[PDB]
Amino acid sequence: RADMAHSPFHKAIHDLEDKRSKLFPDRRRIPGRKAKLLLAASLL
Amino acid sequence: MQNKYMQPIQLFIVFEKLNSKMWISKKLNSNHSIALIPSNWFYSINLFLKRELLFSNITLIENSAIDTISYNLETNQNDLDKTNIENYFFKNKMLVFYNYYNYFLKSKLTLFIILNNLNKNIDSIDRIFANANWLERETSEMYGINYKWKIDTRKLLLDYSKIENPMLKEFQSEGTQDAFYNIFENQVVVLKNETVEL
Amino acid sequence: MNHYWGSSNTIPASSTQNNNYFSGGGNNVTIRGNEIMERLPSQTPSQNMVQASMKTLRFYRKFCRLIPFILRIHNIGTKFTAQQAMINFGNYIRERNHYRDPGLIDHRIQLGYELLYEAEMHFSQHTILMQYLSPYNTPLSDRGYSYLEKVKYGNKSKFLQGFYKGNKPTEF
Amino acid sequence: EKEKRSPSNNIIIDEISNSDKPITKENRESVAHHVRQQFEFFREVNAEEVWSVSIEEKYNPELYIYKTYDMAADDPVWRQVKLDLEWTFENIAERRESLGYMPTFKGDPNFWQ
Amino acid sequence: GYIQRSNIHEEAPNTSVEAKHHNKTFYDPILDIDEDLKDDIRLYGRDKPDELDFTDVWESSYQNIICPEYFYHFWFCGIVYSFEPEWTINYPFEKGPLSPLFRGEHALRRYPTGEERCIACKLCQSACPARAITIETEPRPDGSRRTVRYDIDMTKCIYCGFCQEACPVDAIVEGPNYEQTAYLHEDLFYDKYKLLENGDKWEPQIARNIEYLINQPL
Amino acid sequence: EVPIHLRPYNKEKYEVPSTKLKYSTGYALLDVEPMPRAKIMKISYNILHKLKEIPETAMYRIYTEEKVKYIMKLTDEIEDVRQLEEEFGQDSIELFIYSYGKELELVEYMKHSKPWESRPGDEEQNEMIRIASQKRVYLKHQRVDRPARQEAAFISS
Amino acid sequence: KMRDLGFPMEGEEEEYIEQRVFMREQLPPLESEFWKKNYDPYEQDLFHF
Amino acid sequence: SPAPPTIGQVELEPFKFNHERDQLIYGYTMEELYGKKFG
Amino acid sequence: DILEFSRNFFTTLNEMHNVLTYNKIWKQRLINIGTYSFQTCLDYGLTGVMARSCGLKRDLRLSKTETYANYYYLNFRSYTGQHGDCYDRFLIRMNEMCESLNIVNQSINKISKFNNIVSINTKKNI
Ligand SMILES: CCCCCCCCCCCCCCCCCC(=O)OC[C@H](COP(=O)([O-])OCC(O)COP(=O)([O-])OC[C@@H](COC(=O)CCCCCCCCCCCCCCCCC)OC(=O)CCCCCCCCCCCCCCCCC)OC(=O)CCCCCCCCCCCCCCCCC
Ligand code: SF4
Ligand code: SF4
């Protein structure tokens, strides 16, 4: 079943590390990082 | 029909003075059941449906009418059997049908009501099912059913300052009048109809 | 009363008052009300031709009370006088006076009220709605009529008049 | 003898289900039996559904959360859809390049002799 | 008709590494961070968490004090999307993609000998949903079954294609012409003259399309 | 020993805190009930109390009483909320509670409608049903024999 | 009276007012209300006047 | 027969406000009844 | 060509999503506007996206007795919201557009010959 992992229907499964890294983000958003940076920078 | 199905016999168990006439066909969905309901009990039956436990989760999907007076079997006339629903069309002036869907029972329930009085009187249920308002307005205007105790009887989908029931089999598709522009009156007017016959 | 005809649906006479400092009143019979008509409940069923006739008379009374406002807004006063329009609609009702079915009469009264409301609210056009008010056999008052047919066929039967007029194009 | 059914029996005909147990006012146990049957149907009809109802889904909700610029990235399935599409395109391109040419239909006026 | 099923549940595909069809990169730890946000009553309803945290304070301050819309969206759309080539097709000097199945302007064809392919069977007239085709036929002096009047009301006709589908000899064909704008309503009352002229003018392309259409079943 | 439908409402038995509740109902603006068993019991007892206005022989009353008895017995037997939900379909218990609460209002509607009595139009409905079941034949298929010669009559004298 | 009817009583709850004042449907009329002998508007009986 | 327990129109409602919830949860706590809510 | 369109449709979805989904003005315009419960959904016969925005979980394609095409034998997902407002409806429409790509991909794969004859000697496709 395509909606679940490791389904036989999936075809692009071998050696997709580089392709996935290029296509999708490699970063996670910290909740208050932008807020703290912008506010402190604005005050100073 | 490889599903779990049960007849909606609750209505006729509760309304103990009514006789049951129910159908299911492969022409319909597996969970679809038709029944005959008298007009004088239609309103009370809808009251029971709208607030019974298992019928509480019921929505009025559709409502319309059929001009059964001019209904004739054009082919396979002899194959008709006394159990077929078509037997109730003959000689009856109108047949108004409602269709509901119930979520608890995952079922579809259609009710057929035969109108034999010439004025086509029947109690409205738009006070029980809100969406029935415009459905009944359309049915009344297009077929001339005189709904009683209806929230709003004003026409819906018909032209202004005109009275007619086009969906009746007597009416002609070309209509009875055409709207043109009159220079003498400098405005749109309506006059008698002349059309093209293929 | 929560209805289009309710006594509280009047148009205020002032921004800060209703027609007076010691009283509250407004006109809603000879003109359209303040709030639009959101719902028009069906006429309560009439079990008797007496009730049906009363409904017809009350509807005609409302139409007569409203006709001058309709004429003024639609600019059709020249075509016919208020009384002429009343008499023409009376003839319209007379043609239907043979009804003897209370349910049909109730349905007709509902339709009449609906069309009257449309005329009040300008939903209909004057040329489209004047067909009900037009005289049955009298010329329109805003036009010059032609009496050529009457002069030609004076003191002749309607059959002969129709025979000479014809009822089909002669080209084909 | 004549109508082939007992006077107590309420069933004129039951082609729908051929039920042999009538529901009548006199036999009050018929009402209880019908109620039990109705609740049995209410349970079983919902049980047989594949997507409409699921107690497991009710007690373990699965949500889709918009958290990145690419809405496909938020779902593992949609990322795989993108990858499969690109894989199919690459496979088609490889096959065609290996073949080296493409046959095509050429109009011929002599077809209309 | 229906089928019987014994196992309602569609079990998940095997997750073992040794088994074939195993995708080692299906799940990304950086991206699949749903579990962190899954337990949030705000997502499930109107209620609020028991204990609010300063993260909400920082997020609200960022959203309100420094309105990020006018910068985030302005950049992402105005500055970036403007770098894509225009999608416009210069109609006067270029045409959009069409297909041989395109239904444009009706026309009447002829055999290669010059004889009309139209025999007055009226199948097209009957199939015309809009009653836009009028046909009257009289025997020709040589004896051929040929129409004397074949009119198509282009204003009354819906370009469905039923006429060419029902034609048994490919007489009436809805050729590819679509630039048939008319200034007078009478110019849209196509007659047999107009249809035959259209067929004579557009036979090459119509024949080219018909070749491919006929060869497809083969 | 006493029937559940005759026993007085037992607040202590039912109105107790319950763990393992759903985090959300899955429907918008449908909060989670903390005491589904208590709500079902209260609704059932109120419905039974209000049914006494309907005649005892009424099939509506019989049907409603049997349904309420079945629901109460099942709820008393099954303390686990998840098991109770599995029995009552497989949807949220809150939706079932909301649907069940409407019978309190339905009781008065049915009392006024009086489904156990006969309306005047039942005879007309029966006539319509009877006529709808008649055998029908067509003139086209009816045999017609050639009539015999008409005997010419002459006035006497 | 509003709290008895169930209206919002807090600022944060003011945003769901429509769900408690307007969304709730009105109970349909009892069928006994369709059987009244007469439907004329009520007026004081002027007997003895 | 025993008098049925009082049931108000508020209880039959699908969702509850603060004052409506307070009467029902009287003698208990929101965490105790509905469980702890995270964010 | 349909597969190529499906691949490129993610770009258009993301372009719209970037300017609409997270925009403060868009959220303030839609969120908590037009809110309605299941009962409204039920009373007025609301269906499809309008119904699913209430969480009714009503889809005719994934119904045992009401499926009408290959849908019942495809593994796709239908989405519902816990808030019955315009914002939830917009999100549902976007997700349904995205999931139509997956359904189309599955449908096209159902008529595809992925495997091929493999030579015994070389173990390569012929
Ligand atoms: C004269 C000619 C001029 C020609 C001009 C031509 C036009 C130029 C246009 C330029 C436009 C600006 C650039 C836009 C880039 C967009 C990139 C993008 O898509 O990502 C967005 C990105 C965030 O999105 P994302 O990273 O995808 O988010 C996902 C993350 O996973 C989420 O992760 P997270 O949320 O956890 O954190 C992510 C965060 C990263 O956060 C962090 O990592 C912060 C960590 C610190 C937290 C605070 C703690 C304290 C830290 C400091 C401590 C110091 C003391 C330490 C003491 C120690 C003691 C022991 O990302 C950010 O940085 C967001 C902050 C936004 C800043 C806004 C920048 C406005 C630029 C305006 C430019 C205007 C130019 C006008 C024209 C020129 C002048 C006239 O935001 C940016 O980075 C914005 C750009 C920042 C500047 C980089 C470029 C600088 C150079 C610009 C040169 C311009 C050309 C001309 C120069 C002059 C030539 C002569
Ligand atoms: S295109 Fe369709 S509607 Fe138009 S003439 Fe041909 S068959 Fe008739
Ligand atoms: S165009 Fe074709 S279908 Fe129409 S009359 Fe001629 S031969 Fe028959």
Side-chain angles (χ1 to χ4, degrees):
Chain A
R1 53 187 298 170
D3 58 354
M4 299 201 70
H6 316 301
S7 182
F9 299 146
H10 298 339
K11 293 95 74 176
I13 63 181
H14 299 99
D15 303 325
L16 275 294
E17 289 72 7
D18 187 0
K19 198 167 186 173
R20 288 176 174 272
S21 67
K22 285 186 171 63
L23 262 57
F24 305 108
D26 64 330
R27 193 73 167 186
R28 182 172 181 178
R29 181 175 186 275
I30 306 302
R33 177 162 293 186
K34 287 180 184 168
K36 296 171 184 178
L37 175 67
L38 295 175
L39 292 176
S42 298
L43 180 60
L44 268 59
Chain B
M1 287 183 170
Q2 306 301 339
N3 66 318
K4 303 173 191 173
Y5 166 87
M6 183 178 179
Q7 304 177 21
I9 197 66
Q10 294 74 17
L11 284 174
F12 310 96
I13 286 172
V14 169
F15 295 84
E16 59 184 347
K17 301 299 182 183
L18 286 62
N19 57 270
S20 307
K21 293 288 183 298
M22 294 179 293
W23 291 269
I24 65 177
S25 181
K26 290 188 177 179
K27 303 174 183 296
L28 306 165
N29 294 123
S30 304
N31 63 324
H32 197 340
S33 180
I34 279 59
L36 278 171
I37 295 301
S39 61
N40 50 318
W41 293 93
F42 184 72
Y43 182 82
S44 62
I45 289 162
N46 280 256
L47 275 177
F48 178 85
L49 289 171
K50 184 57 172 178
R51 282 176 174 74
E52 187 63 8
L53 169 53
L54 297 186
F55 289 111
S56 167
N57 288 23
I58 191 174
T59 73
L60 196 161
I61 297 294
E62 182 59 10
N63 162 31
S64 180
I66 324 190
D67 186 11
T68 59
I69 194 68
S70 300
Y71 184 87
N72 304 317
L73 292 176
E74 299 293 353
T75 64
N76 296 328
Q77 291 77 350
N78 182 264
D79 298 338
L80 185 69
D81 52 2
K82 298 185 178 182
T83 61
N84 256 323
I85 190 175
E86 290 75 29
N87 300 272
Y88 302 93
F89 301 165
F90 305 105
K91 306 182 71 60
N92 294 333
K93 188 167 190 180
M94 196 66 64
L95 170 60
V96 65
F97 74 87
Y98 299 72
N99 175 26
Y100 321 78
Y101 177 80
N102 185 346
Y103 289 85
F104 278 143
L105 306 178
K106 308 292 183 182
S107 64
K108 299 178 179 181
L109 172 61
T110 286
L111 311 179
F112 286 92
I113 303 92
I114 296 286
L115 306 176
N116 54 23
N117 50 16
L118 306 181
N119 55 31
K120 309 171 189 175
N121 283 332
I122 181 176
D123 289 327
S124 175
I125 58 169
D126 58 331
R127 298 183 177 278
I128 308 176
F129 295 91
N131 62 2
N133 186 28
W134 290 12
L135 297 175
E136 292 178 355
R137 290 174 63 179
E138 176 181 351
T139 300
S140 174
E141 80 174 28
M142 304 294 268
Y143 290 92
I145 283 69
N146 174 24
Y147 281 105
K148 298 151 59 180
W149 308 105
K150 184 160 171 43
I151 292 174
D152 186 0
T153 59
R154 285 162 44 257
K155 294 183 295 183
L156 187 75
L157 307 171
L158 269 184
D159 191 2
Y160 302 113
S161 59
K162 190 193 300 187
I163 302 172
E164 57 178 7
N165 308 128
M167 289 297 167
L168 294 176
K169 290 293 181 183
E170 62 180 1
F171 199 84
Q172 302 291 342
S173 297
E174 290 77 21
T176 54
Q177 61 190 29
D178 287 342
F180 295 87
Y181 171 80
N182 195 331
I183 291 164
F184 298 106
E185 302 180 7
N186 290 317
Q187 191 54 220
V188 172
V189 310
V190 67
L191 47 73
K192 204 167 68 62
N193 184 18
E194 293 76 2
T195 60
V196 202
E197 185 182 0
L198 173 56
Chain C
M1 196 69 179
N2 189 359
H3 197 279
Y4 179 74
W5 294 327
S7 58
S8 296
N9 193 22
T10 61
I11 302 176
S14 180
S15 302
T16 59
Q17 279 186 339
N18 297 340
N19 107 93
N20 262 329
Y21 75 96
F22 62 96
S23 300
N27 176 16
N28 193 16
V29 179
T30 55
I31 62 177
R32 54 164 167 265
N34 191 18
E35 308 186 45
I36 62 176
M37 180 183 291
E38 202 280 342
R39 55 201 288 174
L40 182 60
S42 63
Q43 299 282 324
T44 56
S46 55
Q47 306 296 351
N48 304 328
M49 284 302 306
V50 180
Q51 298 175 342
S53 184
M54 293 296 177
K55 291 181 179 182
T56 301
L57 293 173
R58 290 157 186 175
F59 165 71
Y60 189 64
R61 186 188 308 128
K62 190 59 164 56
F63 170 88
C64 291
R65 282 166 170 168
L66 269 170
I67 188 64
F69 172 77
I70 299 175
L71 298 180
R72 198 187 93 259
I73 63 178
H74 289 285
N75 186 30
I76 50 171
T78 308
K79 290 175 177 60
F80 27 67
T81 314
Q83 284 67 31
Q84 292 176 337
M86 294 176 188
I87 295 169
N88 299 331
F89 195 69
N91 289 332
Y92 182 93
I93 293 179
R94 286 178 184 91
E95 287 183 326
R96 281 74 177 177
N97 66 5
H98 64 272
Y99 294 175
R100 290 290 186 274
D101 194 356
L104 184 62
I105 295 166
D106 302 358
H107 205 234
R108 292 290 187 276
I109 295 296
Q110 294 173 9
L111 296 173
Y113 276 133
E114 175 187 353
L115 298 194
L116 185 61
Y117 176 83
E118 294 174 2
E120 298 169 45
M121 284 293 183
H122 270 286
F123 296 167
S124 311
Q125 193 65 22
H126 68 284
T127 60
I128 303 294
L129 67 87
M130 67 180 186
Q131 61 184 1
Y132 295 88
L133 316 179
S134 301
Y136 276 67
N137 56 329
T138 306
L140 218 61
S141 301
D142 64 326
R143 298 165 169 271
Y145 58 88
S146 170
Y147 51 91
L148 172 153
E149 179 268 8
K150 191 167 190 178
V151 169
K152 292 295 102 182
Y153 308 151
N155 292 20
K156 293 189 179 182
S157 61
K158 300 182 293 186
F159 172 91
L160 185 56
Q161 296 175 358
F163 176 89
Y164 286 144
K165 292 160 182 176
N167 64 330
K168 187 196 79 66
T170 57
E171 285 293 347
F172 190 94
Chain D
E1 288 180 357
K2 291 213 294 181
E3 298 200 3
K4 309 299 181 298
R5 77 178 196 271
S6 179
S8 300
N9 184 14
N10 182 34
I11 309 182
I12 304 173
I13 189 177
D14 192 3
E15 298 176 358
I16 292 178
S17 61
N18 301 112
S19 181
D20 296 325
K21 293 182 176 298
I23 308 302
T24 57
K25 181 177 182 178
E26 293 72 20
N27 183 269
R28 192 168 194 273
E29 298 183 2
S30 294
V31 182
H33 180 272
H34 164 263
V35 169
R36 288 188 278 95
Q37 178 180 358
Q38 177 180 222
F39 277 95
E40 176 64 10
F41 168 82
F42 173 50
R43 186 173 72 263
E44 296 296 346
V45 67
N46 292 269
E48 63 172 356
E49 294 298 344
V50 181
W51 170 96
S52 296
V53 308
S54 179
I55 192 68
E56 286 291 356
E57 176 60 13
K58 288 289 182 178
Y59 271 87
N60 300 328
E62 181 65 9
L63 304 182
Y64 176 85
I65 308 178
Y66 299 80
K67 45 186 172 297
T68 60
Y69 306 114
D70 188 0
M71 62 190 304
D74 299 355
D75 191 325
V77 180
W78 292 339
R79 303 199 295 266
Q80 192 62 37
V81 170
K82 286 181 170 180
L83 294 176
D84 292 0
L85 294 169
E86 298 189 27
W87 178 87
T88 300
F89 306 147
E90 291 174 351
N91 177 22
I92 294 295
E94 291 168 3
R95 296 162 69 87
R96 294 196 180 189
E97 182 179 359
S98 297
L99 179 53
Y101 68 93
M102 186 69 173
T104 55
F105 179 96
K106 180 68 69 174
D108 196 359
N110 61 30
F111 177 88
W112 298 102
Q113 283 185 141
Chain E
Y2 217 86
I3 66 175
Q4 299 184 0
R5 291 180 59 177
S6 61
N7 184 23
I8 188 177
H9 301 77
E10 296 78 355
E11 299 184 6
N14 182 11
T15 59
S16 64
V17 180
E18 293 78 355
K20 188 170 181 179
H21 304 293
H22 178 74
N23 191 338
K24 304 186 296 185
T25 61
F26 189 86
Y27 293 95
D28 188 359
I30 296 172
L31 303 175
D32 299 1
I33 58 177
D34 297 79
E35 68 288 344
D36 297 66
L37 314 174
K38 179 171 61 57
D39 292 328
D40 183 0
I41 188 63
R42 285 178 285 92
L43 278 51
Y44 299 93
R46 69 185 191 282
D47 298 321
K48 298 291 177 296
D50 295 0
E51 190 278 339
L52 297 175
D53 192 65
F54 298 99
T55 290
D56 195 332
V57 162
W58 287 107
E59 290 289 4
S60 184
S61 303
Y62 167 73
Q63 288 293 345
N64 297 121
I65 297 175
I66 300 173
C67 302
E69 313 92 39
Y70 310 94
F71 311 95
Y72 167 27
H73 304 293
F74 167 83
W75 161 266
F76 244 86
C77 168
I79 290 167
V80 180
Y81 302 171
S82 303
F83 297 160
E84 192 67 10
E86 59 274 6
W87 297 328
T88 302
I89 302 172
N90 311 122
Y91 158 69
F93 320 93
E94 306 177 355
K95 294 183 176 296
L98 297 180
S99 186
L101 298 172
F102 180 74
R103 345 196 194 96
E105 188 180 6
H106 295 103
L108 289 169
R109 293 209 303 168
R110 301 184 180 187
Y111 289 108
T113 61
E115 174 60 297
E116 292 177 5
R117 302 170 78 94
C118 165
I119 48 168
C121 78
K122 302 190 178 63
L123 282 176
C124 78
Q125 177 186 355
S126 59
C128 174
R131 289 81 174 275
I133 307 181
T134 304
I135 309 179
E136 287 181 342
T137 163
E138 182 182 356
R140 210 155 66 176
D142 64 72
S144 298
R145 180 193 177 100
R146 296 294 184 275
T147 57
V148 293
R149 174 260 283 278
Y150 189 97
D151 304 353
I152 301 180
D153 183 2
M154 306 300 294
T155 63
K156 194 188 297 91
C157 109
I158 66 186
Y159 297 79
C160 53
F162 285 14
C163 66
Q164 60 173 3
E165 291 185 9
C167 178
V169 294
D170 294 358
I172 186 70
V173 296
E174 207 163 355
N177 185 20
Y178 60 95
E179 297 128 329
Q180 33 165 352
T181 310
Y183 285 76
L184 287 67
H185 191 200
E186 291 75 350
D187 294 1
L188 295 176
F189 296 150
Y190 285 12
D191 198 355
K192 188 171 181 178
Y193 284 113
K194 178 64 175 180
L195 297 171
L196 284 174
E197 188 174 3
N198 296 14
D200 298 2
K201 292 186 298 187
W202 292 90
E203 185 61 15
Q205 182 174 349
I206 295 169
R208 175 58 172 82
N209 295 330
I210 292 286
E211 288 175 24
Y212 182 79
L213 295 183
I214 293 172
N215 281 271
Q216 266 187 338
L218 283 61
Chain F
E1 298 178 355
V2 184
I4 186 65
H5 70 278
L6 299 182
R7 275 179 286 179
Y9 179 77
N10 190 331
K11 179 166 65 178
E12 283 65 8
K13 183 179 180 181
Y14 303 111
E15 289 187 2
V16 300
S18 176
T19 58
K20 307 178 182 180
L21 291 176
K22 294 189 299 304
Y23 200 68
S24 61
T25 54
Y27 297 86
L29 304 168
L30 186 64
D31 294 0
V32 176
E33 180 60 20
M35 300 178 179
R37 289 167 52 83
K39 264 202 177 179
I40 296 173
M41 290 294 117
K42 292 179 184 179
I43 296 170
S44 298
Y45 283 113
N46 285 275
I47 292 168
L48 289 177
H49 176 262
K50 298 219 295 181
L51 280 177
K52 294 186 177 301
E53 300 167 359
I54 288 69
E56 300 180 4
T57 57
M59 279 296 298
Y60 167 70
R61 174 170 176 179
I62 296 171
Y63 173 79
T64 311
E65 286 184 349
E66 294 295 348
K67 182 168 61 176
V68 171
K69 292 167 183 180
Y70 176 94
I71 294 172
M72 283 193 302
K73 289 180 182 179
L74 190 61
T75 299
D76 182 8
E77 289 175 358
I78 305 177
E79 63 183 1
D80 190 71
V81 179
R82 191 164 181 172
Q83 295 177 7
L84 188 60
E85 290 179 357
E86 291 176 7
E87 285 291 350
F88 293 143
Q90 290 184 338
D91 204 335
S92 303
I93 196 71
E94 289 69 15
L95 184 60
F96 181 88
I97 299 277
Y98 180 82
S99 296
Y100 193 50
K102 301 179 185 179
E103 294 190 351
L104 296 168
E105 295 74 16
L106 174 59
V107 165
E108 186 171 358
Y109 276 111
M110 290 300 98
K111 173 176 65 176
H112 283 77
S113 290
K114 303 180 181 180
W116 55 88
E117 293 187 8
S118 303
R119 302 187 205 279
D122 297 2
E123 181 59 18
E124 184 178 4
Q125 181 64 8
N126 298 334
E127 163 55 19
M128 190 282 297
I129 294 297
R130 184 195 64 81
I131 186 60
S133 63
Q134 301 298 342
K135 178 186 173 184
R136 62 192 71 267
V137 299
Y138 298 85
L139 289 160
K140 186 179 183 181
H141 302 295
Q142 281 192 337
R143 176 183 176 179
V144 62
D145 302 327
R146 182 183 180 277
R149 180 178 64 83
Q150 295 186 8
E151 308 300 345
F154 304 98
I155 185 61
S156 300
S157 184
Chain G
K1 275 65 183 176
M2 288 176 187
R3 69 168 181 81
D4 290 328
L5 269 56
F7 291 8
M9 297 280 91
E10 295 176 345
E12 62 277 11
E13 297 176 344
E14 293 298 346
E15 64 184 348
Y16 298 102
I17 183 176
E18 67 282 0
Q19 267 65 42
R20 273 291 198 271
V21 306
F22 181 54
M23 285 295 180
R24 283 188 287 182
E25 299 297 334
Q26 297 189 348
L27 295 171
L30 302 166
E31 196 172 11
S32 295
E33 303 180 11
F34 308 160
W35 305 337
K36 302 177 183 176
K37 277 60 178 179
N38 192 19
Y39 293 98
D40 292 0
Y42 173 83
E43 56 185 357
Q44 209 292 299
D45 186 7
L46 300 185
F47 210 77
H48 309 298
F49 287 73
Chain H
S1 298
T6 62
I7 184 174
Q9 297 299 140
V10 62
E11 302 185 14
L12 303 177
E13 304 300 342
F15 66 98
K16 304 291 185 297
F17 287 141
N18 285 277
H19 61 277
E20 305 175 337
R21 283 179 175 178
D22 190 0
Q23 300 173 345
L24 274 58
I25 73 187
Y26 178 74
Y28 292 96
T29 302
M30 290 295 296
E31 289 186 355
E32 290 180 0
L33 296 181
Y34 301 87
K36 185 150 55 175
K37 300 181 179 60
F38 312 91
Chain I
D1 285 61
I2 291 169
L3 292 172
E4 181 184 355
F5 160 87
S6 300
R7 175 57 185 92
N8 278 119
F9 188 62
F10 294 101
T11 305
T12 300
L13 283 176
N14 300 333
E15 284 178 345
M16 301 179 64
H17 160 78
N18 290 328
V19 302
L20 295 180
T21 303
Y22 303 123
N23 198 327
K24 180 183 172 180
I25 301 168
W26 188 257
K27 285 194 293 183
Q28 292 181 351
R29 290 280 300 200
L30 297 201
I31 292 163
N32 219 292
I33 276 79
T35 290
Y36 50 72
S37 198
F38 71 95
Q39 190 61 23
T40 298
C41 263
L42 202 77
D43 296 15
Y44 278 84
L46 302 191
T47 178
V49 156
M50 264 204 102
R52 281 193 289 271
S53 62
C54 301
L56 281 171
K57 187 153 52 171
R58 166 55 176 176
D59 192 334
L60 197 139
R61 311 190 303 274
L62 295 174
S63 174
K64 178 182 177 62
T65 55
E66 303 169 7
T67 185
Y68 56 92
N70 312 273
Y71 292 110
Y72 189 77
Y73 296 99
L74 298 178
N75 296 100
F76 63 97
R77 297 163 297 181
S78 172
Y79 307 87
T80 68
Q82 293 80 341
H83 317 73
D85 50 6
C86 294
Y87 196 65
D88 280 54
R89 272 166 277 186
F90 162 80
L91 297 175
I92 290 169
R93 293 180 200 278
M94 298 294 292
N95 274 28
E96 288 184 1
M97 283 193 298
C98 199
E99 193 69 4
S100 296
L101 298 183
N102 182 19
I103 298 174
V104 169
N105 178 27
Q106 292 174 306
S107 175
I108 294 172
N109 297 341
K110 292 288 175 185
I111 52 173
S112 309
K113 188 179 74 63
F114 298 109
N115 203 12
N116 191 84
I117 299 174
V118 177
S119 57
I120 303 172
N121 301 325
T122 315
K123 306 302 298 302
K124 293 181 179 63
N125 297 324
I126 309 179

